[PDB]
Amino acid sequence: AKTTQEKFDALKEAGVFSGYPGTTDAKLGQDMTRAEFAKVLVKLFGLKEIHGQYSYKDKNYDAKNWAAPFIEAVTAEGLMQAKDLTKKIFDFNGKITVEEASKTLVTALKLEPVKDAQNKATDWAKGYFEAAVNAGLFSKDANPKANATRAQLVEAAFAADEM
């Protein structure tokens, strides 16, 4: 019965979340960005931020971009990668679908995708979305093809942290 905001507040006490500068609004109903998901992965899984390195050519991907040390850490692990692998564009403000987040979290948690799963996800992601639902990361009624909200990543992170 813990509310999503209560889960956010617990995770903020734990250092996994921090919210936005200068405001207490967690913006739980907005879509999470790729940069924000990289940060949460680093904190959840005990990865080390990598400073001073820039693998991507996106505009404003530089030392003034708060998310670069997190993005570099998850990139070096193979947990995330460029949206355009040839042009080296990460798309840091881009969105992330439920099924994409499922793949990444299941991998990071060392969970195994379910073979021969039947669900609404894209074919390549069905096993991962099923594993994520079975592990309590996302609701069985989540739309795997929709962009994941910050709320959903709070719920997922809270569940992953408890594991």
Ligand X SMILES: CO[C@@H]1O[C@@H]2CO[C@](C)(C(=O)O)O[C@H]2[C@H](O)[C@@H]1NC(C)=O
Question: What are the residues binding ligand X (CB under 6 A)?
Answer: 17-21, 36, 39-40, 66
**Of 19 and 94, CB closest to ligand X:** 19
DSSP conformation letters of 118-150: -SSS-GGGHHHHHHHHHTTSS-TTS-TTSBPBH
For 13-21, which contacts have Cβ atoms below 8 Å and span 24 or more sequence positions?
A: 14/161, 15/43, 16/40, 16/43, 16/44, 16/157, 16/161, 17/43, 17/154, 17/157
**Of 111 and 154, CB closest to ligand X:** 154
Q: Taking a C-beta distance cutoff of 8 angstroms, is the pair 74, 47 a contact? A: yes
Q: Shortest distance, CB of residue 24 to ligand X, whole angstroms?
A: 11
**Of 59 and 115, CB closest to ligand X:** 59
Residue 35's H or E segment, with its range, is: helix 34-45
Q: Shortest distance, CB of residue 119 to ligand X, whole angstroms?
A: 27
Q: Shortest distance, CB of residue 134 to ligand X, whole angstroms?
A: 25
Q: Shortest distance, CB of residue 31 to ligand X, whole angstroms?
A: 11
**Of 17 and 92, CB closest to ligand X:** 17
